[model samples]
Target chain A: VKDLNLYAKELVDVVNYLMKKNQLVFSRNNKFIYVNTETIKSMLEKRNYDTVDGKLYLWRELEWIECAEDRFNKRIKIDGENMYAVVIKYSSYSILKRLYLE
Target chain B: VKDLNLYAKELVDVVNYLMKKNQLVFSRNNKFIYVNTETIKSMLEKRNYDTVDGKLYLWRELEWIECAEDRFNKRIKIDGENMYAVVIKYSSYSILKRLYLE
Candidate 1:
């Protein structure tokens, strides 16, 4: 079986893929993909947005464990598993952001 | 077969385990575990530390992709398998601190 470090890297790859294949999401200067609740329309169907209000939100930075606990709302997977939420929350947040923050 | 998000979380678990059992490393305010050039002796044999020389260094935050690229020195594993370095570098850095950045 793979380890958590491996899992987190996979999250980046997944994000990179999403950014590369479709214009739904993107990174800032290829840093972390800039998002401001505007350029996320294509991912509207994959909606699961939630976060603070803001004009500029840096969309992609992978932090697996804490994301699991905080952003993911403590989601669960297999037994003793709560890490799966990283991808879920990350995708959702990028799709939309800072709606009322404006 | 696992994904990167999962691997990143697993990295956290590994850190948690080291903190829970050995006490070689620790998180600050239960947030990310405070570490420094000192307090890393038990892990000296496990030494792989390399970072800025500071009185206080936060040791535990799992970012598998960037860590693989930057901190892991772009180390590789199986073909297209550079992520494995996460575990290696994390452990090494924690065991020791920056005499010089790696």
Candidate 2:
């Protein structure tokens, strides 16, 4: 019982530490991490980035930060650059229109 | 024919007038008009009204004005007060969490 509790505590600690930064860390094998930027940008454009301040502000306005804690994945090394990626999928304009407008 | 064109123009004028105020107008017979406020308020609470400014500001931030033009229903008389109601259903918190967090 003691060993199980200790292991559980360590797991919780690791998760808490990873989520402190609100970013998703991907391993080097995940070559598609860079591709996520394109998806994010496309989604941003649909949300009217020109009208809004920028990506960060839009994320803030939509309350995406609260979501960051749970969505963060795993840490990894990519080409000697230590970085993390967080992928957030916002409600698409069409879906929003259908749900709210139509 | 000239009569058809005039009728079409008149319909357009009426739609433009109703939409100008950006309020949905339901007839007095629609006894359920008042019921909409509850749904709106419940949705508002889920959206964190305490954290955000208020209902009007939240609506503005969500870009609900653009949607106002099309969603306007019709005019109504409720309790002797001339008022129109616009119902805007935002993406629910659960759905938002599923899309962005989960």
Candidate 3:
């Protein structure tokens, strides 16, 4: 089992990976990331995106939790069970600010 | 007697008060608030300021704890024991984007 620090590190790593992979989507209006259907479905399926919202939508087995920022209408779902956490934001990449893990 | 939400609310109130009172001093170089000597001494003395950093240096009875942000050479001493927390940041107030109580 991962401890708090480990978990936090893992979260950071996952976020970093998504940013690099261009899998992170940001909001069109606010410039913050928004959760999309592809991201949610992938998280629910528990599979990492190869093309990330590009390839055909397929379901993979994964444990996930969903959260949202209602003010921006942004939704996020993370795979709680995996060592990694997959986040889906509702918007575009340019709107990316800082991802605070608290 | 206060629950988590109440404590959080009180903290917010204290921070807001400090911001309003001009008691929050920021750093010269950066826009963040920096903790000053008078703020520490006053907090230790448990006294509220009539003229922040200007008046008589009288000792007041208060419980306080000091913290610092070494990056900007900023320090803060908060009165944790009292119902409201008095925070003295070692920087400018404009640097305060938001205060999160978590």
Q: What tens digits encode model 3's per-residue C-alpha lDDT throughout A1-102?
A: 111122223334444666687876543453233334444345434433333332211101100112333221223333432122223322211111222221
- Candidates, ranked, TM-score: 1, 3, 2
True contacts kept of each: 0.21, 0.00, 0.00
TM-score of each: 0.29, 0.21, 0.24
True contacts kept of 2: 0.00
Give the per-residue lDDT of model 2 (tens digit) for A31-99.
Answer: 222213333344335433132124433333333322334443223346675444433223322222232
Better of 1 and 2 by lDDT: 2
Over the true interface residues, superposed, what is the Cα RMSD of model 2?
23.6
Distance from true position, residue B76, model 2, in Å? 8.9
User: What's the distance in Å from true for residue A48, model 3?
Assistant: 15
DockQ of each: 0.11, 0.01, 0.03
Encode model 2's per-residue lDDT on B1-102: one tens digit a residue. Answer: 011122222223333443465533443453222223333344335433142234434334344322234343224346686544543222322222222322
Which residue ranges in model 2 land beyond 4 Å of their true spot? Answer: A1-102, B1-35, B38-53, B64-83, B89-97
Candidate 1 chain B has its poorest 10 consecutive residues by lDDT at B51-60
Q: Rate the local accuracy (lDDT) of all candidates.
A: 0.31, 0.33, 0.31
Question: lDDT score, residue A77, model 2?
Answer: 45
Candidate No. with top DockQ: 1
